[PDB]
């Protein structure tokens, strides 16, 4: 017969193997293909869709309160309004996003991120903000003089209600890791901080306490590798029919 030697890896079941197998229903005619809209070919298409961030992930906000940032008229100048941790692997504003949830199914990632902020005050309310992305190395900035020295965008409120800040791919390595150690060189992305450029100015007829909604997506230069079981979902037993 055909001369044969069973190698190491014979009789093994690998969950990532790519082989044809015996058809259980021989000559079975599957249902004809029908056009359905919104066909997804790549997970990289979904991470490019904007998703809201829990910037207000505090132990006083409940439900929809956590997805909006209360911006007010300040009796001060240059003050920090809010921060955004960029630790996708750790419990932070980016975790429960399309970027977060789907990237969290992978171990390595590379590429530039976009973060869009929609102002939701009054048409009569004006203001200028400065959102800054600080690359990693040291502490998160608390003064505008320090934050302005990093990648930033100055935001003028008006007819265009939203601003994008591109968090550009700035790393020594081709990829970063979704690691449990946030302070690791392999994992750390740096900081996003928002300061008052001028102030929020609202006339008497308009509310003084407005809101900002933050969205985050990936750009076309975005990549994920080394698939893994997501830590988002857990299981203590086989799920029953009822309970």
């Amino acid at each position: 017969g055909v001369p044969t030697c069973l190698l190491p890896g014979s009789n093994q079941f690998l969950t990532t193997d790519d082989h044809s197998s015996a058809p259980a229903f021989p000559d079975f005619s599957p249902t004809p293909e029908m056009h359905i809209p919104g066909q997804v070919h790549s997970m990289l298409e979904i991470v490019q869709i904007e998703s809201m961030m829990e910037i207000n992930n505090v132990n006083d906000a409940s439900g929809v309160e956590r997805l909006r940032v209360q911006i007010s008229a300040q009796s001060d100048m240059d003050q920090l309004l809010f921060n955004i941790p960029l630790d996708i692997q750790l419990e932070g504003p980016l975790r429960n996003t399309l970027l977060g949830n789907i990237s969290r199914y992978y171990t390595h990632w590379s590429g530039s991120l976009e973060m869009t902020f929609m102002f939701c005050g009054s048409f009569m309310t004006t203001g200028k903000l400065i959102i800054c992305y600080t690359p990693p190395g040291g502490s998160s900035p608390t003064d505008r003089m320090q934050a302005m020295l990093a990648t930033h965008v100055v935001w003028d409120f008006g007819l265009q209600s939203s601003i994008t800040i591109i968090i550009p791919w700035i790393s020594g390595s081709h990829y970063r890791m979704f690691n449990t150690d946030a302070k690791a060189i392999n994992a750390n992305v740096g900081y996003v901080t928002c300061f008052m450029q001028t102030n929020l100015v609202a006339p008497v007829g308009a509310a003084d306490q407005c809101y900002i909604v933050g969205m985050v997506a990936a750009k076309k230069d975005f990549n994920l590798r080394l698939m893994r079981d997501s830590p988002d979902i857990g299981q203590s037993a086989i799920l029953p029919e009822q309970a």
Binding site: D18, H19, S20, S21, A22, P23, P26, D27, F28, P30, P37, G38, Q39, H41, S42, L44, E45, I46, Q48, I49, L159, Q160, A217
Partner: protein, 40 residues
Amino acid sequence: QINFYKDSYAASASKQDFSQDPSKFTEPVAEALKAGAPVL
């Protein structure tokens, strides 16, 4: 793909389709948004 069996559905993982159209989800607007333009 290879397939040692009669049926086509018995074949291994299908040949990589690298087609992407994220506009379906990212810009699903009747009038297309022009880059740099005020999109009002």
